[PDB]
Design a protein around this ligand. Sequence first.
Ligand SMILES: Cc1cc2nc3c(=O)[nH]c(=O)nc-3n(C[C@H](O)[C@H](O)[C@H](O)COP(=O)(O)OP(=O)(O)OC[C@H]3O[C@@H](n4cnc5c(N)ncnc54)[C@H](O)[C@@H]3O)c2cc1C
Ligand SMILES: Cc1cc2nc3c(=O)[nH]c(=O)nc-3n(C[C@H](O)[C@H](O)[C@H](O)COP(=O)(O)OP(=O)(O)OC[C@H]3O[C@@H](n4cnc5c(N)ncnc54)[C@H](O)[C@@H]3O)c2cc1C
Ligand SMILES: Brc1c(Br)c(Br)c2[nH]cnc2c1Br
Ligand SMILES: Brc1c(Br)c(Br)c2[nH]cnc2c1Br
Ligand SMILES: [Zn+2]
Ligand SMILES: [Zn+2]
Lengths: 230, 230
Amino acid sequence: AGKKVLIVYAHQEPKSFNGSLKNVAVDELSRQGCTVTVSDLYAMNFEPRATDKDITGTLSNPEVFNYGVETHEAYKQRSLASDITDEQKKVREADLVIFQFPLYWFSVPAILKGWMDRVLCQGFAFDIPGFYDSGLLQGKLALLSVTTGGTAEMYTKTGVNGDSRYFLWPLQHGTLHFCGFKVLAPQISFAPEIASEEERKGMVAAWSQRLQTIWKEEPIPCTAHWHFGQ
Amino acid sequence: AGKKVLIVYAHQEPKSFNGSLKNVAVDELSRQGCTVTVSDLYAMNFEPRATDKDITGTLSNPEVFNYGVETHEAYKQRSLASDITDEQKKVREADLVIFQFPLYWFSVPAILKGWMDRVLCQGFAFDIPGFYDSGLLQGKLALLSVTTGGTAEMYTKTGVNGDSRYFLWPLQHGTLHFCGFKVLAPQISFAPEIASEEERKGMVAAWSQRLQTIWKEEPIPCTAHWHFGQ
Ligand SMILES: Cc1cc2nc3c(=O)[nH]c(=O)nc-3n(C[C@H](O)[C@H](O)[C@H](O)COP(=O)(O)OP(=O)(O)OC[C@H]3O[C@@H](n4cnc5c(N)ncnc54)[C@H](O)[C@@H]3O)c2cc1C
Ligand SMILES: Cc1cc2nc3c(=O)[nH]c(=O)nc-3n(C[C@H](O)[C@H](O)[C@H](O)COP(=O)(O)OP(=O)(O)OC[C@H]3O[C@@H](n4cnc5c(N)ncnc54)[C@H](O)[C@@H]3O)c2cc1C
Ligand SMILES: Brc1c(Br)c(Br)c2[nH]cnc2c1Br
Ligand SMILES: Brc1c(Br)c(Br)c2[nH]cnc2c1Br
Ligand SMILES: [Zn+2]
Ligand SMILES: [Zn+2]
């Protein structure tokens, strides 16, 4: 019936190819009757830095600042900064989290890295126990929709950049799998800037068309073998 | 004789293990007579977000903002924000760039990711063509000094996190190699929080010790095979 979707979106420009991918996702999921929420990081001027400002009140140890320990305690004592808890609420309510971003240095743009660093704290996303298959967000789906400057050719095992699955590893496995997400196959839109309209539209349509049956999909086996083998 | 080093340092707490590893680097490189500079990113409140504030001149396309295009042109024109060019000057003068950071989500902390996103712009760090072995920072060395929460065993091929080299790919190859750096072998200090006081002191001294002969080192072959195996 009614699945809830959070789109975490990281692009500066509404007219961008990333913006269109985000908008057709909102459009198509909305059409299906899904509950949809968008975190527009640049528009929110989202704070990427992990600092002691992320804890309100009294630090667990104001002499030596340990971010990980202090945020773990602030979570369990409900004293995290509100920009963080706002995002955790959106994530708690979502059944599927889509990340929409241009590839920046084989990874996410820093503003989105900061979202991962600050929002996915211990207590909330992971714990002992509860990581990988049993991470605290199990039951949820996650999907990386990434756009690139480099063509698909460049992202082959014999290409200069190596297989795109190589750079996926820290995101899909080290971050998403670690928190208990089932990981849906990445959506990779290769090299929009150098493409035609026929190809570009094609890529947007693939995405829109894929979203039509997203709820029927099987997760990938988020394994070293999936990423590095064959 | 006259080597110049830049340490790009990303930890909030001077008394931290990262702080100590950064201080022993400065101590030992300074002892050797090297020229040493540190960018203490949190202390500088370094801006991680790639935004249109990074360009102060007339935009090449004011209607649709394209960060990579606008910063490339701004670099040529000299209309980049001055925090960016301050860093570029440090890099340009360095013979060796050391990155000192705790592993955050199989990667660098967002404030450091932002340094990479914003500082290594087209025209300065790379060109098209002019990347990988043709990168503009060719002739320079780079080295990742990483600390982890995870133990070394967790970071092996058969361990839960996979081999440590797997997560190095986006950083060593996708970023440093792409810009033309030769990459020295990573320094990874595993699980200092778990370690005994003696093991901690030893890990610090192992780093100091290595630094005594850093200038005699050859780089790694920064290739898929090195990172992933056969
Ligand atoms: C700091 C930095 C680091 C980077 N690192 C990497 C890297 O490691 N690897 C890599 O491969 N690339 C890298 N890039 C390149 C970057 O990933 C690409 O520039 C980015 O993915 C392009 O996506 P976009 O949404 O910004 O494209 P846009 O320029 O915004 O859009 C492409 C074109 O599509 C058009 N368009 C918009 N909407 C539609 C629509 N609905 N239908 C048809 N056309 C439409 C736009 O008008 C535009 O002309 C990096 C770039 C930067 C700035
Ligand atoms: C957002 C986030 C994401 C993370 N993601 C990952 C991840 O993906 N993978 C992973 O493995 N880990 C991860 N971690 C854990 C993180 O990498 C470790 O907490 C970090 O590497 C520890 O380094 P530190 O400098 O902060 O240790 P500290 O806590 O500062 O140091 C540990 C101990 O060393 C002591 N010490 C300091 N100086 C000396 C000295 N000179 N001699 C002896 N002892 C000394 C300190 O006092 C302290 O007791 C993450 C943490 C956070 C907050
Ligand atoms: Br493959 C690659 C590409 Br194609 C681009 Br445009 C880029 N811009 C900044 N870093 C990069 C990389 Br690593
Ligand atoms: Br060991 C470890 C790992 Br392996 C990850 Br992926 C992580 N994310 C936040 N903290 C951590 C730790 Br402490
Ligand atoms: Zn996995
Ligand atoms: Zn390489």
